Amino acid sequence: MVGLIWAQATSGVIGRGGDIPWRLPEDQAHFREITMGHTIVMGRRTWDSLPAKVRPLPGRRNVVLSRQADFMASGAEVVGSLEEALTSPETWVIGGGQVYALALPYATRCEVTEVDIGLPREAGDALAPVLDETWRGETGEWRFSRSGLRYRLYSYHRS
Amino acid sequence: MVGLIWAQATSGVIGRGGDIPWRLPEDQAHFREITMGHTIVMGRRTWDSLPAKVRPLPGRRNVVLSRQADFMASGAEVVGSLEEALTSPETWVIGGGQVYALALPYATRCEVTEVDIGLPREAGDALAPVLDETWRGETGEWRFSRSGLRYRLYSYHRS
Ligand SMILES: NC(=O)C1=CN([C@@H]2O[C@H](COP(=O)(O)OP(=O)(O)OC[C@H]3O[C@@H](n4cnc5c(N)ncnc54)[C@H](OP(=O)(O)O)[C@@H]3O)[C@@H](O)[C@H]2O)C=CC1
Ligand SMILES: NC(=O)C1=CN([C@@H]2O[C@H](COP(=O)(O)OP(=O)(O)OC[C@H]3O[C@@H](n4cnc5c(N)ncnc54)[C@H](OP(=O)(O)O)[C@@H]3O)[C@@H](O)[C@H]2O)C=CC1
Ligand SMILES: COC(=O)c1ccc(-c2nc(N)nc(N)c2C#CC2CC2)cc1
Ligand SMILES: COC(=O)c1ccc(-c2nc(N)nc(N)c2C#CC2CC2)cc1
Ligand SMILES: [Co+2]
Ligand SMILES: [Co+2]
C-alpha cells in the first residue's frame, strides 16, 4: 500500500524556502502516528530540510529520492526511482511537492491536513497535488490547535 | 494492515437477532469504498446473515472464520484461524462482535459509523469492541441519512 501524507494551507502551499511556514503540533502527532513503523519516502530537498539531529525519523524506514546516483543520506536509503522506494507493504510518501506529484498515480490513500491560514501561493512555493473527484475524500471538521491555528483533516481513498 | 470496519448505535450495539436494526445506504457505500478490492474477514454468523444472492461480496477476497472444519461457504475461503487470512496486503475485518474482539490485537485502523439511534443494549446483542487509550480517533460531523437517522464516521488509528 502506497499512501501520501501532507499538510497544506487552504491555497495548497506545503513548503517554502526549504521550510514549512507554520507550526501545527497536532498535525505532527497525526503525522507521527500514521507513519511510524512504516517505510517513508521523501524528496532529496525534504531530506535536506531536516536538521541532522532529527534525521532519520525514528522507527520508520527512511528512503530518499534523488537523481544523484551517488547521493548520500546518512541514515536513509537512496533510490533513483519511486518503485525502488515503494518496495514496502505499507509505504507513506511524506513530501515534498515534487515527490507527491510523482507518486500520486501509485497511491490509493491521501492523508491531508488542511491549515486555515491565508497563505497565498508565491512563485517557487511547493504545492500539494490537487485531488480530483476520483478521490473519495472524507472531510473532518475545523479543529482548533494549541498553536492558535484552525485546522481539519481529510482522508482520501480511491478503489 | 489489519482494519476493522463496523456500524454501531450510540449504545455500542452492532447486531441483534443475527442482523442489524437499521439500514443506511450512505454507510453501505462507505463500507464498499473502504473494503473493495481487499480481503474481507467475517465470522460464520455474519456470513450466515448474507443472502446467497449477495455473497460473496464482489471484488474482495471473502474469508469466513468457523470452527467447523467442514463448513462450506460457497464463494469464500473458510479458515479456522485468523492468522490464515492475513496474507493479503490490506485486510478488513467486517464483523461481527466475536470476530471484532478476536481481531483487535492485529488492528491499526477502525472505521466506525456511529448511528444516532437510541438503541439500549440487551442480552444477546452483538457489540462493538472497546478501544483502549492507544487508539486515537478523528471524530466526524453529524451527517443526515436519507433513512432519517443522523450518522457520523470515526477513524481510529494506532501505530
Ligand atoms: N507541508 C508538508 O507536508 C511538507 C512540506 N515539505 C516542504 O516541501 C518543500 C520541498 O519540496 P520540493 O521543493 O517539491 O522538493 P522535494 O522535497 O520534492 O525533493 C525534490 C527532489 O526529489 C528528487 N527527485 C524528484 N523527482 C525524482 C525522480 N523522478 N527520480 C528520482 N529523484 C527524484 C530530486 O532530488 P536531486 O535534486 O537530488 O535529484 C529533487 O531535487 C520544502 O519546503 C519542505 O519543507 C516537505 C515535506 C512535507
Ligand atoms: N453493524 C455492523 O457493522 C455489523 C453487524 N453484524 C452483526 O453482528 C452479528 C454477528 O456477530 P456475532 O454474533 O459476534 O457472530 P460472528 O459474526 O462473530 O461469527 C461468530 C462465528 O465466528 C466463528 N468464530 C468465532 N471465534 C472463532 C475462533 N476463535 N476460531 C474460529 N472460528 C471462530 C464461529 O463460527 P462457528 O460457529 O462456525 O465456529 C462463530 O460462530 C449479526 O447480528 C450481524 O448482523 C455483522 C457484521 C457487521
Ligand atoms: C516542527 O514541524 C514538524 O515537526 C512537522 C511538520 C509537518 C509534518 C508533516 N505533516 C503532514 N501532515 N504530512 C507531512 N508529510 C509532514 C512532513 C514532514 C517531514 C519532515 C519531512 C511533520 C512534522
Ligand atoms: C444492504 O446493505 C447492508 O445490508 C449492509 C451494508 C454495510 C454493512 C457494514 N457497514 C459497516 N460500516 N461496517 C461493516 N462491517 C458492515 C458489514 C457487514 C457485513 C455482513 C457483510 C452492513 C450491512
Ligand atoms: Co482501498
Ligand atoms: Co500504521
mmCIF file of C-alpha atoms in Angstrom, chain A residues 38-42 47-48 50-65 70-79 94:
data_model
loop_
_atom_site.group_PDB
_atom_site.id
_atom_site.type_symbol
_atom_site.label_atom_id
_atom_site.label_comp_id
_atom_site.label_asym_id
_atom_site.label_seq_id
_atom_site.Cartn_x
_atom_site.Cartn_y
_atom_site.Cartn_z
ATOM 1 C CA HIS A 38 6.386 2.049 8.058
ATOM 2 C CA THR A 39 8.556 2.970 5.100
ATOM 3 C CA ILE A 40 8.631 6.713 4.432
ATOM 4 C CA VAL A 41 9.778 8.173 1.102
ATOM 5 C CA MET A 42 10.833 11.796 0.642
ATOM 6 C CA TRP A 47 15.727 15.279 3.463
ATOM 7 C CA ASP A 48 17.910 18.384 3.250
ATOM 8 C CA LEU A 50 15.744 18.237 8.238
ATOM 9 C CA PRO A 51 18.416 19.202 10.786
ATOM 10 C CA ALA A 52 20.914 16.367 11.020
ATOM 11 C CA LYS A 53 19.835 15.923 14.650
ATOM 12 C CA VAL A 54 16.290 14.984 13.559
ATOM 13 C CA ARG A 55 17.012 12.665 10.665
ATOM 14 C CA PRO A 56 16.351 9.846 10.047
ATOM 15 C CA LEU A 57 12.878 9.870 11.516
ATOM 16 C CA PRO A 58 12.766 7.278 14.357
ATOM 17 C CA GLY A 59 11.106 3.927 13.913
ATOM 18 C CA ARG A 60 10.460 4.271 10.171
ATOM 19 C CA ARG A 61 12.305 3.072 7.080
ATOM 20 C CA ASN A 62 13.711 6.363 5.716
ATOM 21 C CA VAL A 63 14.115 6.373 1.919
ATOM 22 C CA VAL A 64 15.295 9.398 -0.122
ATOM 23 C CA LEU A 65 14.622 10.098 -3.823
ATOM 24 C CA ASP A 70 25.961 8.747 -5.632
ATOM 25 C CA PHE A 71 23.986 10.880 -3.206
ATOM 26 C CA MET A 72 24.417 10.053 0.450
ATOM 27 C CA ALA A 73 21.768 10.393 3.038
ATOM 28 C CA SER A 74 23.330 9.213 6.321
ATOM 29 C CA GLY A 75 20.642 7.028 7.896
ATOM 30 C CA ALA A 76 18.364 6.562 4.900
ATOM 31 C CA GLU A 77 18.217 4.580 1.687
ATOM 32 C CA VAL A 78 18.742 6.487 -1.542
ATOM 33 C CA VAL A 79 16.904 5.247 -4.596
ATOM 34 C CA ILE A 94 5.929 12.266 3.072
#
